[PDB]
Amino acid sequence: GPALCLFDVDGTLTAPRQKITKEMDDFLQKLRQKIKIGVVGGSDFEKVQEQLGNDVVEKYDYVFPENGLVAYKDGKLLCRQNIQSHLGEALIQDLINYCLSYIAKIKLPKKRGTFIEFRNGMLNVSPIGRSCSQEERIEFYELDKKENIRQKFVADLRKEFAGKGLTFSIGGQISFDVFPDGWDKRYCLRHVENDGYKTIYFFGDKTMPGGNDHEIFTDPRTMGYSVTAPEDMRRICELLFS
Amino acid sequence: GPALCLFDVDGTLTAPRQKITKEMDDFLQKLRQKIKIGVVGGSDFEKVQEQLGNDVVEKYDYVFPENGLVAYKDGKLLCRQNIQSHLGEALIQDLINYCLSYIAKIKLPKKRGTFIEFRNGMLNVSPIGRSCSQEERIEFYELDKKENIRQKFVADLRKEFAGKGLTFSIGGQISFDVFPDGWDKRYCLRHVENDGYKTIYFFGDKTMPGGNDHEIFTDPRTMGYSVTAPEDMRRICELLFS
Numbered sequence: 046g047p048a049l050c051l052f053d054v055d056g057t058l059t060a061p062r063q064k065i066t067k068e069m070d071d072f073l074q075k076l077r078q079k080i081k082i083g084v085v086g087g088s089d090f091e092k093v094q095e096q097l098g099n100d101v102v103e104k105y106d107y108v109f110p111e112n113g114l115v116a117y118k119d120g121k122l123l124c125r126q127n128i129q130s131h132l133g134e135a136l137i138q139d140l141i142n143y144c145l146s147y148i149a150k151i152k153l154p155k156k157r158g159t160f161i162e163f164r165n166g167m168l169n170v171s172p173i174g175r176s177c178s179q180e181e182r183i184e185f186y187e188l189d190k191k192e193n194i195r196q197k198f199v200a201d202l203r204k205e206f207a208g209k210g211l212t213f214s215i216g217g218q219i220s221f222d223v224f225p226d227g228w229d230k231r232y233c234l235r236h237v238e239n240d241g242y243k244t245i246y247f248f249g250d251k252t253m254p255g256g257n258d259h260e261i262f263t264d265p266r267t268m269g270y271s272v273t274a275p276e277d278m279r280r281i282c283e284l285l286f287s
Numbered sequence: 288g289p290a291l292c293l294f295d296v297d298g299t300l301t302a303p304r305q306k307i308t309k310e311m312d313d314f315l316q317k318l319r320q321k322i323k324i325g326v327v328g329g330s331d332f333e334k335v336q337e338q339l340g341n342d343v344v345e346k347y348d349y350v351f352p353e354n355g356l357v358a359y360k361d362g363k364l365l366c367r368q369n370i371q372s373h374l375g376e377a378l379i380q381d382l383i384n385y386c387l388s389y390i391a392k393i394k395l396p397k398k399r400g401t402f403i404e405f406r407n408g409m410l411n412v413s414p415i416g417r418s419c420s421q422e423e424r425i426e427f428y429e430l431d432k433k434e435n436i437r438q439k440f441v442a443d444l445r446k447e448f449a450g451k452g453l454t455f456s457i458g459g460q461i462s463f464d465v466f467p468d469g470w471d472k473r474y475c476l477r478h479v480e481n482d483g484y485k486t487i488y489f490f491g492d493k494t495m496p497g498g499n500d501h502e503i504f505t506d507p508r509t510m511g512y513s514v515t516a517p518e519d520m521r522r523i524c525e526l527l528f529s
């Protein structure tokens with residue numbers, strides 16, 4: 046029946062960290078004549094626009110930056126949630142208060158600023174501070190491997206906030222993310238489920254346990270496909286839809 | 288003897304929140320044929336470039352972004368300074384640690400992110416977090432006026448650290464600044480007081496207490512002139528230098 050293809054962006058439609066190629070851009074627009082298409086990424090709208098184009102909300106039937114915490118359908122923004130409204134101010138403050146006190150007790154070479162970055166769909170927590178310089182970021186990343194600073198911090202937060210409906214995830218070099226359970230890429234499915242699609246396909250390059258496509262891939266609402274590269278994505282689409 | 292004119296940038300060489308005009312820029316290059324000129328501002332070099340032109344270091348004999356913590360003379364970097372280098376990483380971290388722990392204990396209706404904004408010349412500290420919305424800023428300031436949150440916080444910091452040569456200044460609705468003693472616009476006077484000037488003129492538009500030109504205006508090493516607008520600065524320069 047009527048169906049939808051949901052694509053991870055980075056590593057799936059694009060080489061890691063790159064803009065999409067015009068060839069792949071043309072392929073997806075031809076695919077879209079047979080089936081609706083949508084993209085989902087953890088990065089913010091501006092990054093999605095850089096990777097896929099400023100006119101992204103016109104070229105894709107759905108656009109889900111920030112895992113869908115910002116969501117466009119048919120070019121218009123859908124209803125929105127944020128972490129503080131979902132969790133309540135009291136839990137937000139307890140989480141922040143705890144993280145602030147914990148960071149105060151970490152011994153580091155350097156500390157700077159923006160220890161807590163408050164985003165739509167998460168708190169990003171950095172022991173050094175997100176305002177650090179590139180040199181300081183690498184110094185921290187290197188010490189963190191040696192001392193397990195972020196790993197211990199997250200293990201402590203998981204016990205302290207057991208039962209409160211939070212997920213913690215270390216990514217990148219200086220930080221970890223604290224977000225409501227289920228606000229990974231599965232969040233966007235709320236905007237497409239039970240909306241007439243007989244099948245919702247999903248394509249992603251990090252569907253393994255621990256990868257950022259694992260939960261949406263394994264969700265029963267999607268017919269999930271693991272891709273190894275954008276050329277593998279195109280291969281599967283030509284098989285299924287041509 | 289030989290003299291130097293030092294100008295505030297915003298509101299003195301430019302209309303507030305506006306770029307320098309071509310006509311003013313021409314005026315200063317003519318004035319520079321008669322007397323050395325310099326600019327000092329609170330903003331970083333990139334912002335000074337936005338206000339005065341990317342070639343700013345070529346158009347003035349001295350350029351002092353960040354109150355002189357960055358100093359250019361005759362087109363080349365004379366000196367760079369920042370709070371972490373001056374205070375040392377140990378003291379930086381003790382200050383930040385104390386503020387993080389303290390903020391973790393403040394009871395507020397809301398907390399957000401960027402409790403500590405690290406700048407080259409100061410730490411900007413906010414119990415609620417600088418990322419909060421304008422509505423949240425107003426709510427906080429109402430509570431602060433009745434609970435004296437920022438006053439008690441600064442009082443306790445003054446007891447604990449000010450012997451380390453630190454100043455604390457409350458301002459606006461949600462934050463206070465922590466900075467080494469004398470790191471206001473006066474800081475830049477160290478870079479010109481050795482170059483043989485008999486008079487250092489200073490022109491600024493916020494020369495009253497509280498304003499960011501007040502300390503440099505009042506410093507005995509400057510011949511200070513308060514100006515209401517760029518046109519007023521120009522009228523005064525006409526009478527002084529023809």
Ligand SMILES: O=P([O-])(O)O[C@H]1O[C@H](COP(=O)(O)O)[C@@H](O)[C@H](O)[C@H]1O
Pocket residue numbers: 169215216217218219220221222
């Ligand atoms: O590098 P950071 O700490 O600024 O972290 C940045 O990138 C990470 C992912 O990076 P990757 O996919 O390469 O693991 C994200 O988890 C994080 O939210 C973001 O702020």
Ligand SMILES: [Cl-]
Pocket residue numbers: 158159160161400401402403404
């Ligand atoms: Cl912070």
Ligand SMILES: [Mg+2]
Pocket residue numbers: 053054055056057249250251
């Ligand atoms: Mg990917």
Ligand SMILES: [Mg+2]
Pocket residue numbers: 261262263264265266267268269
């Ligand atoms: Mg599935």
Ligand SMILES: [Mg+2]
Pocket residue numbers: 295296297298299491492493
């Ligand atoms: Mg001014």
Ligand SMILES: [Mg+2]
Pocket residue numbers: 503504505506507508509510511
């Ligand atoms: Mg004076």
Ligand code: NA
Pocket residue numbers: 089091092
């Ligand atoms: Na961005």
Ligand code: NA
Pocket residue numbers: 211212226
């Ligand atoms: Na869980």
Ligand code: NA
Pocket residue numbers: 477480481
């Ligand atoms: Na000196």
